[PDB]
Design a protein around this ligand. Structure first.
Ligand SMILES: *NC(=O)CSP(=O)(O)OP(=O)(O)OP(=O)(O)OC[C@H]1O[C@@H](n2cnc3c(N)ncnc32)[C@H](O)[C@@H]1O
Ligand SMILES: [Mg+2]
Ligand SMILES: [Mg+2]
Lengths: 303, 13
């Protein structure tokens, strides 16, 4: 009988409760809800739950499969944590930790002073920006340590917690590079052009160095409150422009300090761009007191 | 769902 070979992540649908829509993914839905006893010590836990549309294509379900699986093996304060999986019945439910304020792009946009949904507080300060950069870098460094290239780092894929901690999310495009330290895409596929490195666009190659390039664009998204990168140029135009050595300007009044990291991230030669650990190292001295307490950078694991 | 953020493609090289 099957009962004697259970999945440790299986969770009873009975423990899950949906409250509202947190957003819509390209082929599923993300809901906010609470789950009864899914974490030892917590009677109830606020959570985000991802579903998959009946009409989801094989490819999409295959991408959804990878997302959940790579996550099963992560454990880092700056990475969205997987909590359980409901598969006994339909529809399948993937339960993750709730990031109260949603994705960074949305969040950033709400802080605009004219935003119809401004929460009542000023745009991110220099300090709050370094903190974000530092948290995204840490999570990513952890990811790199585990030997995984994300391939799709952007504001939309970064989440913001109730306490405002930013964490890496959406691991659908993630790939193991353990043996070769790189991933070379084969055929055709939906790629996030406006966030890709030149070598990745030219030869379809992905490294932690290309992920560093995306980080820079995320810094840019951050300092412009999530405007559109290469605003006014079609994906085909950007592709040609970047491969020719092109890159983004510094958003208006972008902090000098932030502009520097972007200069480093967009070096044409991938080997010259910095690594995430070096990025946390550059900012470690101007962060919340709790950082050394939860960062991967400060943990014994980082060896 | 930022669909516009993706382009169907194969390495130009
Ligand atoms: N290249 C791409 O990543 C696809 S475009 P996208 O807008 O990023 O959508 P997609 O990645 O397909 O969206 P996803 O299903 O991941 O989720 C959509 C929105 O739901 C909110 N969300 C997701 N996980 C959340 C957690 N854990 N907690 C709170 N809110 C969550 C976000 O607003 C996300 O944009
Ligand atoms: Mg996404
Ligand atoms: Mg996805």
């Amino acid at each position: 009988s099957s009962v004697f070979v259970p999945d440790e992540w299986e969770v009873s649908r009975e423990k899950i409760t949906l409250l509202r829509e947190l957003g819509q993914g390209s082929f599923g839905m993300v809901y906010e809800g609470n789950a009864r006893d899914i974490i030892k010590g917590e009677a109830e836990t606020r959570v985000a739950v991802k579903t998959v549309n009946e009409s989801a294509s094989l490819r999409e379900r295959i991408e959804f499969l990878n997302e959940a699986s790579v996550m099963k093996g992560f454990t880092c304060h700056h990475v969205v944590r997987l909590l359980g999986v409901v598969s006994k019945g339909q529809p399948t439910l993937v339960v993750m930790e709730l990031m109260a304020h949603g994705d960074l792009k949305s969040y950033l946009r709400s802080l605009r002073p004219e935003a119809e949904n401004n929460p009542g507080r000023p745009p991110p300060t220099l300090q709050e920006m370094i903190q974000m950069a530092a948290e995204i870098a840490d999570g990513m460094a952890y990811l790199n340590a585990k030997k995984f290239v994300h391939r799709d780092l952007a504001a939309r894929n970064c989440m913001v917690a109730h306490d405002f901690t930013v964490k890496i999310g959406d691991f659908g495009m993630t790939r193991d590079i353990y043996e070769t330290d790189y991933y070379r895409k084969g055929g055709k596929g939906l790629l996030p052009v406006r966030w890709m490195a030149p070598e990745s666009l030219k030869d379809g190659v992905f490294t932690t160095s290309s992920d560093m390039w995306s980080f820079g664009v995320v810094l840019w998204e951050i300092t412009s409150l999530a405007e559109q990168p290469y605003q006014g140029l079609s994906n085909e135009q950007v592709l040609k422009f970047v491969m020719d050595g092109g890159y983004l300007d510094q958003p208006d009044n972008c902090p000098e300090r932030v502009t520097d990291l972007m200069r480093m991230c967009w070096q044409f030669n991938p080997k010259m761009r910095p690594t995430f650990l070096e990025i946390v190292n550059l900012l470690k001295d101007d962060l919340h007191p709790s950082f050394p307490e939860v960062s991967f950078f400060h943990s014994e694991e980082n060896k | 769902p930022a669909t516009g953020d993706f382009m169907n493609m194969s390495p130009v090289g």
